[PDB]
Design a binder for this molecule. Structure first.
Ligand SMILES: C[C@H]1O[C@H](O[C@H]2[C@H](O)[C@@H](O)[C@@H](O[C@H]3[C@H](O)[C@@H](O)[C@@H](O)O[C@@H]3CO)O[C@@H]2CO)[C@H](O)[C@@H](O)[C@@H]1N[C@H]1C=C(CO)[C@@H](O)[C@H](O)[C@H]1O
Ligand SMILES: [Ca+2]
Length: 840
């Protein structure tokens, strides 16, 4: 209640009283005081000598003259004595007068050191360190930890009497696509659970708040007009988006993004529009794909079934590997005989991504050889570097203990499968660490060969076969050639010189019997035809054939029925750094050097109520995830990722890349509280609009980004922006909130001292950043052009988006809560007499 009276505390107690009752003599947060707060007293004991008359800019720790309890005063006195070379300690029976005289001595010698040592910085550090020793002011009162990635979270109370500026009518949690109405959707049964959880990392954005929802749409419009807005260059806009962390945010965002793409880009009218803005989800629940399909196929999800199938049938260690038939049937699309003009559901397919099956491997290495107590993905840079030593040796072993086997086999399937958009991971062609595109992996040659051949040969219907041979099994996968959807189609000239056969085994012990025959039906267009190898497993790796002349001596022929026939002389198991099993790829002889069997999207009207259609034109696309979490930091400008991308767009065009998925371009925060802010990938940020504008991002300056987008567009490659509405990191201004310790679903942890309790968070942006410039700056334009976006009543809330408020400054009122900050349950100071919080 406004008046810190200093009585029976410190011998010097009438000089230490507060300068005035003004708030400007206290370092306060929302007019509360913290254990680390400093204040301006009336007099300063200058050099610990003379009670200097004035105080001006002379702020001193409040813990120098005031304490919450006598026990804390004693702890402070013992601590500060040790810090200042005063060899006296006071145990739990010493009395008040002794403590006040000790505190006076400590004050005097503090002021001596302040005038000796130039500044007060050391005192800030020493006071905060002491405060961290106190359980009411550190992690101890925030325990027990839980399986939140960062050990826990607190949820901000919607009605806090002491913090009404942080109140909310929303904070509706866990409204995943499965759980969007607050009840588990009865349509979707592949996932038993509620399909996600609200609290993932750092400060959790409340995407149930209509004002926030509107600001998310503002941001989306900004990214898709980045060229126009920042550089007045319409050739430098992002073309599409990736929706990050779908299962940790309110699913209303899916309708908002879809609606926006329909209204602003017309993706629902024809395939040309849709494919010009092909947008994706990172949505891990198996309900998300049927959900997104019922929603209109306005975006596409990953095929997680196919992914797991590749992982467990090919990538895992030999003794943990599953049988091979899942590669055919355990997918969105059963590829036994895929003869459809248009598959039932669109999707993209991958084996590794910047996060998936990379940071998992680094964590495995750390947990098993460095620090067994590693928490989630909260690595230190030192742990990361020691782990990449192990990782990089394992990559080249024949017997891998940590990294994937059979990468080239995985890509042989991904890049010749029908009915999916493959997404190539950067770190599978180039090293996961090091400078951008500086070092090829051992699989670069095979993968590049596959990408080029995909342009030239991959089209038509598909047939996958699983054949038990000798002591093991193989699969064949065949594409019939352009224009041949069914195996009986005899084709035209281009059919004859396209199509492909892939043969794989996942067991190095594979031995065929002398009587075994692998009869690969190529299709009715390929009777009595010469075929040559594209990829062949060898003893030490994979031989790639880049031309018909490079393979001139290995030609073989189909019989009169269009069958290639293989025996033990052709197929056996191998064990080398690239293959644990067997891989062979064959193409028909004689395709023109410029043969291109891809197909452009039609402008014919769409008539089935979906926007994206998995047909030959979409199957003609290739997505490229163009970064690695663990890229080195550029040492000179020519090593900047976006600079290098601009310098190699010819390479991406020759690989058939149609969609370049760039890293998130937001300037990263540097708090190091998660992997993303340690290696600074772009997913941990404080300013949604700072795309390398105030400072370069890890990939270059904003002009480097503009030039990279233009260079990609100059080859017809579309460019994808990473929409990250889940969380934000490292806000520069503190705020006092009413909070409750919770699990990642928002359920309160009992036995917790944080329960409708004052808590100090970092949750205000500066008001002088890009957010303050652009926040809500396009809502009037968007409402004017597209009123129906603001008319829709969103599913989770029952109301429209609310664009009547612009978010120029983030504040706790717009967030569900935060990961625990190690500040404790009692950081906000109370008058001990009245058990009342101090306020000004
Ligand atoms: C942090 C990163 O992963 C997050 O999701 C993880 C899931 O919680 C895992 O369980 C795993 O999914 C399995 C499902 O739980 C399971 O039910 C099944 O349906 O599918 C999986 C097993 O087959 O997947 C994730 C492991 O990475 C989170 O949802 C995801 O969005 C996160 N990655 C992006 C987001 C951020 C934060 O902005 C960044 O940390 C990353 O770099 C982004 O890529
Ligand atoms: Ca969330």
């Amino acid at each position: 209640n406004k008046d810190i009276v200093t009585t029976r505390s410190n011998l010097y107690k009438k000089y230490n009283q507060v300068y005035d009752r003004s708030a400007q003599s206290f370092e306060h947060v929302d007019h509360y005081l913290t254990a680390e707060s400093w204040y301006r007293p009336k007099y300063i004991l200058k050099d610990g000598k003379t009670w200097t008359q004035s105080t001006e800019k002379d702020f001193r720790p409040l813990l120098m003259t005031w304490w919450p309890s006598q026990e804390t005063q004693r702890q402070y006195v013992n601590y500060m004595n040790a810090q200042l070379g005063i060899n006296k300690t006071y145990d739990d029976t010493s009395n008040q007068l002794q403590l006040n005289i000790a505190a006076a001595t400590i004050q005097a010698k503090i002021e001596a050191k302040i005038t000796t040592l130039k500044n007060t910085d050391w005192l800030r550090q020493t006071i905060s360190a002491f405060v961290k020793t106190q359980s009411a002011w550190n992690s101890d009162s925030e325990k027990p930890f839980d399986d939140h990635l960062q050990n826990g979270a607190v949820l901000y109370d919607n009605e806090g009497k002491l913090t009404p500026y942080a109140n909310s009518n929303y904070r509706i949690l866990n409204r995943t696509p499965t759980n969007q109405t607050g009840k588990k959707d009865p349509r979707y049964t592949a996932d038993n659970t509620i399909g996600g959880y609200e609290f993932l990392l750092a400060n959790d954005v409340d995407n149930s708040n209509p004002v926030v929802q509107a600001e998310q749409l503002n941001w989306l419009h900004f990214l898709m007009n980045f060229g126009n807005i920042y550089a007045n260059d319409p050739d430098a806009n992002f073309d599409s988006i990736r929706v990050d962390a779908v299962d940790n945010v309110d699913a209303d965002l899916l309708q908002i993004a879809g609606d926006y793409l329909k209204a602003a880009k017309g993706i629902h009218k024809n395939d040309k529009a849709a494919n010009d803005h092909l947008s994706i989800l990172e949505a891990w629940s198996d309900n998300d794909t049927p959900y997104l399909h019922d929603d209109g196929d306005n975006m596409i999800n990953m095929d997680n079934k196919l992914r797991l199938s590749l992982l467990f049938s090919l990538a895992k260690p030999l003794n943990q590997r599953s049988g091979m038939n899942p590669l055919i049937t355990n997918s969105l699309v059963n590829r036994t005989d895929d003869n459809a003009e248009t598959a039932a559901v669109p999707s993209y397919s991958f084996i590794r991504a910047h996060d998936s099956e990379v940071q998992d491997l680094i964590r495995d290495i750390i947990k098993a050889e460095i620090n067994p107590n590693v928490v989630g993905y909260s690595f230190t840079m030192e742990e990361i570097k020691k782990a990449f030593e192990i990782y990089n040796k394992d990559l080249l072993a024949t017997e891998k203990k940590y990294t994937h086997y059979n990468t080239a086999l995985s890509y042989a399937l991904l890049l010749t499968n029908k009915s999916s958009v493959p997404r190539v991971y950067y770190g599978d062609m180039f090293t996961d660490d090091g400078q951008y595109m500086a070092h090829k992996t051992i699989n670069y040659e095979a993968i590049e060969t596959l990408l080029k051949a995909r342009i030239k040969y991959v089209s038509g219907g598909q047939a996958m076969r699983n054949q038990q041979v000798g002591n093991s099994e193989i699969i064949t996968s065949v594409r019939y050639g352009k224009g041949a959807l069914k195996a009986t189609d005899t084709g035209d000239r281009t059919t004859r010189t396209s199509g492909v056969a892939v043969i794989e085994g996942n067991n190095p012990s594979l031995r065929l019997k002398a009587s075994d025959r692998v009869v690969v039906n190529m299709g009715a267009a390929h009777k009595n035809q010469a075929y040559r190898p594209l990829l062949l497993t060898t003893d030490n790796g994979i031989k790639a054939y880049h031309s018909d002349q490079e393979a001139a001596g290995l030609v073989r022929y189909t019989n009169d029925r269009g069958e290639l026939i293989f025996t033990a002389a052709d197929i056996k198991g191998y064990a080398n750094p690239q293959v644990s099993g067997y891989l062979g790829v064959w193409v028909p002889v004689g395709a023109a050097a410029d043969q291109d069997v891809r197909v452009a999207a039609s402008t014919a009207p769409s008539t089935d109520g979906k926007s994206v259609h998995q047909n030959a034109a979409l199957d003609s696309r290739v997505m490229f995830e163009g970064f690695s979490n663990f890229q080195a930091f550029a040492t000179k400008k020519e090593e900047y990722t976006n600079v290098v991308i601009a310098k190699n767009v010819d390479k991406f065009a020759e690989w058939g890349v149609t969609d370049f998925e760039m890293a998130p371009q937001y300037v990263s925060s540097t708090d190091g509280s998660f992997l993303d802010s340690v290696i600074q990938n772009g997913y941990a940020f404080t300013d949604r609009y700072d795309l390398g504008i105030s400072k370069p991002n890890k990939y270059g300056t904003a002009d480097d980004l503009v030039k990279a987008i233009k260079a990609l567009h100059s080859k017809g490659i579309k460019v994808m922006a990473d929409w990250v509405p889940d969380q934000m990191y490292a806000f520069p201004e503190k705020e006092v909130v009413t909070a409750t310790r919770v699990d990642k679903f928002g359920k309160p942890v009992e036995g917790s001292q944080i329960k409708s309790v004052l808590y100090v968070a970092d949750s205000k942006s500066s008001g002088k950043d890009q957010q303050a410039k652009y926040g809500g700056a396009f809502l009037e334009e968007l409402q004017a052009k597209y009123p129906e976006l603001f008319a829709r009543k969103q599913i989770s809330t029952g109301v429209p988006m609310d664009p009547s408020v612009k978010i120029k400054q983030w504040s706790a009122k717009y967030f569900n809560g935060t990961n625990i900050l190690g500040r404790g349950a009692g950081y906000v100071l109370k008058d001990q007499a009245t058990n009342t919080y101090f306020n000004i």
